Design a protein around this nucleic acid. Sequence first.
RNA 1: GGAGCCAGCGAGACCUUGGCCGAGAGGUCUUGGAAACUCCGUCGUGCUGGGGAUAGAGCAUUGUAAUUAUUGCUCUUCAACGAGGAAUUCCUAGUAAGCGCAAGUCAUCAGCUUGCGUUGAUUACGUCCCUGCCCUUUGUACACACCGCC
Lengths: 205, 142, 128, 62, 22, 206, 134, 28, 247, 38, 42, 49
Amino acid sequence: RAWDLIRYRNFRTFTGTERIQFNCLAVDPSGEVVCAGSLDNFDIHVWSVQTGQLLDALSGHEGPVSCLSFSQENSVLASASWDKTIRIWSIFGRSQQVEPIEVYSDVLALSMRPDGKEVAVSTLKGQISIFNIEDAKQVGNIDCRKDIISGRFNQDRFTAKNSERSKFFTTIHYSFDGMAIVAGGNNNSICLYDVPNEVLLKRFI
Amino acid sequence: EDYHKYNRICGDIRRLANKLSLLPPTDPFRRKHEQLLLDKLYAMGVLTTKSKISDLENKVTVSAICRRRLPVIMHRLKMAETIQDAVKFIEQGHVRVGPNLINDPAYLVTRNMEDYVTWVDNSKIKKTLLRYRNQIDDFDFS
Amino acid sequence: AVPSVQTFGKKKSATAVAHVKAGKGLIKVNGSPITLVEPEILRFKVYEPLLLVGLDKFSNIDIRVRVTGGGHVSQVYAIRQAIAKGLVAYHQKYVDEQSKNELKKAFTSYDRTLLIADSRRPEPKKFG
Amino acid sequence: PVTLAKVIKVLGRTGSRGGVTQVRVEFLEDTSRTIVRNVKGPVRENDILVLMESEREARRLR
Amino acid sequence: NPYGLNEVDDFASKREKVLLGQ
Amino acid sequence: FEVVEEFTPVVLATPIPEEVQQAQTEIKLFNKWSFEEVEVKDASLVDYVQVRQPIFVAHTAGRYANKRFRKAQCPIIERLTNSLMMNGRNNGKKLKAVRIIKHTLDIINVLTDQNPIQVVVDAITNTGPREDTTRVRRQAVDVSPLRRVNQAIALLTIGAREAAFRNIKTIAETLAEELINAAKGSSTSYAIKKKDELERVAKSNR
Amino acid sequence: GVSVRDVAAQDFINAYASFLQRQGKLEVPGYVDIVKTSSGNEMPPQDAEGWFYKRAASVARHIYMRKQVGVGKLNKLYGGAKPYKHIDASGSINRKVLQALEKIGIVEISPKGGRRISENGQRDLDRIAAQTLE
Amino acid sequence: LREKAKERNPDEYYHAMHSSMDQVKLLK
Amino acid sequence: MLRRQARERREYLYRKAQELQDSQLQQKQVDDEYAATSGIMDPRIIVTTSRDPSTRLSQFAKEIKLLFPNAVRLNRGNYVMPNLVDACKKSGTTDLVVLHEHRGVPTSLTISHFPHGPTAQFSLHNVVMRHDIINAGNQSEVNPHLIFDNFTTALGKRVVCILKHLFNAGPKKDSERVITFANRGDFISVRQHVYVRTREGVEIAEVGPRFEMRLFELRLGTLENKDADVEWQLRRFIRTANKKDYL
Amino acid sequence: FDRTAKPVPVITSEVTESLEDMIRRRIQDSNFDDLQRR
Amino acid sequence: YKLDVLSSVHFVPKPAETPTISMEDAQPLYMSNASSLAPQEI
Amino acid sequence: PYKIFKNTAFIKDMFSSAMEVARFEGAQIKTVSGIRGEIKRALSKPEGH
RNA sequence: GGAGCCAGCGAGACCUUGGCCGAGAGGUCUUGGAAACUCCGUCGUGCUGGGGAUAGAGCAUUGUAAUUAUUGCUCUUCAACGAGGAAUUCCUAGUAAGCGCAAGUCAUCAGCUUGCGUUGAUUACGUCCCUGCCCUUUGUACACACCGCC
Ligand SMILES: [Mg+2]
Ligand SMILES: [Mg+2]
Ligand SMILES: [Mg+2]
Ligand SMILES: [Mg+2]
């Protein structure tokens, strides 16, 4: 559903042909294309903001789409999945191109550098991996497994140090300056990192 | 084995359908909640295939709800010898349903999440499996 | 038990299995030294991981590699991937994670193929 | 002597002949000075071209 | 099968028995 | 002041040649040429004659046809080796292209003492056509740096191939002499002749 | 400590090929000068004086790599492409080579058929292996 | 058997996975 | 995914049993694989050939691409069949067409519908390409009209159903391009014509190509799955084969 | 001697004329077996 | 609610004269109804 | 028969030359055991096969 | 000419591991049921150590009863062919192309069809300028913005 905030009204609504449950969404900076992802189809639906028609469905994921983001400047679309891969979509233009990049494990969250030249992704291994969009090559990585703090639940019958319930980050985001990433997960910890140096700035309870 | 709760769910489904069947067939409200009901029952998997309200009256059973319990699924999926062994693995925290770890044997898998039930990455027992095939990778931590 | 790790490296049908254990610097493929791998022109590829992180890390370990399948070039790529992954796995499971981070940083910096399988799955570029 | 000019904009819809692209380039000697040119090869923004002649003004090539 | 089979698996098992009989 | 990262002498029970140890000191093409002192003299060919990542052998198995401008990231030596392999009968035989380029670089060093890869870069820079013609008759148009690099490589390899196609000279020596002449800028090299001809024709239809 | 596999195949074969020739105790059949080693071939070996000795050296290495070998394997191993038939090597030359080596004591009749590296021969192979290294 | 080999769950776990000629025959 | 494709395969074969008993009881609509998408999403087609295709087959593959509006031709060099089908499914392809030849003469045409079949195999006879025409010109790529004739048996309806969905839905009423599949003793004649409505009738011009296709296998699965259960097979060595009709 | 299988049909002129007559008849009546949007 | 809690991995709370105060509003108080209509609507 | 590949097989001594084979394409044939078959095509070498 | 070696598809007496002869083809006595490529050498712009058609002489295999052909090996003989007109067909990543191996599983195929793996590129990946094929000229389209009679 698309909402006008000056007048506070739902001016348009989009939906799939067979009522697909959506989990993530991304919007063109031009405000003319909207894409959403689902955990049941492995396809990224595309809608036109102006018309409300399904432009097309992007296919190519061998797993469920976990996250989406349109580059603010270049307008590339980067999508990740539990597929252990990341795909960059150049939907705009006469020809459509897709550049897949493999990742060590399932991708839970993705962030996009405001410049639009790099993309960061959090994996189940507890790794925040930064790639170069233009070159499609990894430029940096950060370990997260040890920094995260997870408390043994009252119903747990196994120790917290042995626990693997949550030592990954389910959400990440850049700083607008572009030198830091804020991350969180199903845990008791929020960790702020410094991308170029790959170190922990500070942790929050 | 007690199934009072599951019986309460199945009975409530029947009561909802009966109350629906009372409402006029032409009422648009009746039709959608029927279809919404059939949808969710399909979504959970207790309805293996899309069905009609008449089938939803009788096809729903305690066994179908018991069928979707996480330890039962592993038993069909051949992870554990028996339901008791499956419960112990769920209990010990070696089982993972998609992005999250489930330690509750009482949890049931929805139809979509069935394909992603798998053991946690660093479970010692995975190391046994890949050791048997001799396909253990220490780089992958499993 | 003697510390050891095991890994694979795959390229097309070529598959290489690497066993990396504590030792005194024995790096063997197919029961023969690395210096005898063939073709000679691509020998340096197999030296490339050995040559990047430095041979000091290897003085304390022995690697044994067995390669089957694929052609000459595919086998060479399997050997290089297997040695890289085995080294990383060892330097985790019996050495700190900081050395690990340095190894992955160097390898991925020069070339990511050392660690990730280069599987070029078919892609119908033409929408249709 | 041959001048150098950095491409800033790849003009679109210029109606040029197939395989020829109209572009705008700013001279490195004088960043302000600008000239529109025809390029045969694959071209992008931020590429620098060797303009042997700097006086002419490009025209649509059909 | 302590709790039985759904329709789809039940059909699958029947053919599985038929093929083994052949 | 000293930084010491090793307190023991590194001896590997499996012998390694000492040349490989000096390679551990630095990466070199075929362990015999250094990439440190190479610079593209012409600014235009910079960022499209890529030489800043040193490689031991031209073969890399990289994905360079995926995107529109991944070729620019390719090392120039690998592009030359790929261009060397043509005519069908030589197709798919990359190892022999690598061997030929090795022998060619050896020849270039033998004749002229400068670093042969520097001569390679110089030849590519010099023989690139800066202006060419397009059919409308003809009219002159400018050439993008990527086209300059591609045309330079194609012209050099084609000239070297045709020169030794039915001559006593082998591919390596003809490639060496073509490349040396192009680096000198002398008209003897076939590619320089064609570049000058193209620019002259652009002058006529200017 | 030194072994044949620790030496380059070509280097060891060339070094060991001379040792048979310098030794002068390896029996060489008279018809070495009038054979090609395969019907697919078309001219005799160019190194007429020493090709048989090099032939023996190469065979000696294989018996070390594979414990048991017969003339059948050596026929196929030394065979090549010629449609294409892939004709195997000349059986006679290989058979003479196996007989010639076991006179030297390098090889001896393996159990269950074939040929096996003699323990004296195994030391002999290692002796030249260290010779090339040193 | 092909369908069985085609459909084998890689994650299936079972507990079992944790676990002179005449002169020779006399010797053994 | 391997778990899903298997489960959906086990589910897929379940409907085909379920519908079969329902059809028998009715004996005493559109097929399920197409019922979900019929008239909603335009078919996505890929046309390919066997390894190292000859030039004439490549020309024929281009012709088949022009026949179907949403067909894109893909070169099969070294592609492995599980990889080809797997790759096409990732791209969202609806049907895959593979052409075989004997000495530059097309011989077979197999149509497999994604994701779970069915797979239909045809044999080509009397093939005449448009490249065998001088000064023929180019095709018109409007959505053609479809003619299906003399398809009566249940297997006949099935065959029409397979071919019918390969084209787009809702051709314009005035579209001048008509494709006709005429059954004649199991030999389906395929023709392409362009018509002009005259003041006293219609005049048609044949565009081509000409070729006769005869179904000889129909399996419940993708063409990769050689173990897929056979829905129907052509018996050639039965004593009544010379006069038995199936369509 | 018997033939086990059907002979491959032969496309003669009269078969073509009959075919095109049927095609023309269908276009006259606008009887197209076509997929229509649902 | 019941079917969700069984199938929920995480917490699921149980779903919930005189003049009444509408405790939540779809629109800001200061915004006027006329201002919410486009010129074409008028 | 002298060479068999599952269903397909080559036969000899029935006809003397490929000329005779040509007249009998499509002919119905059967074995003593009762397996029915058909004469597919003539082999160029040798004659009659 | 030597030497070094790396695959994946495939299983309804005959195959065979090994020994002995013969230069080879190929014989005889017994046991169980891959190429391309890479390294070192010879040759050398000469229709040359490229090309192997035709022809002669011999050494053998298979039937069958003929001096019949059949399939291989040995020597000698040593051609057309030196990159292909007018024209024309196709082709964008494991793609063009080179390389070999296997199965002949109801249609088609018998040095033909299919499948399998191995080596592996240049250029383009932008445009409607030419050509061809189409879509629109009742916003109908839920806000903002832009538009405003073919
Ligand atoms: Mg090909
Ligand atoms: Mg072939
Ligand atoms: Mg073919
Ligand atoms: Mg394009």
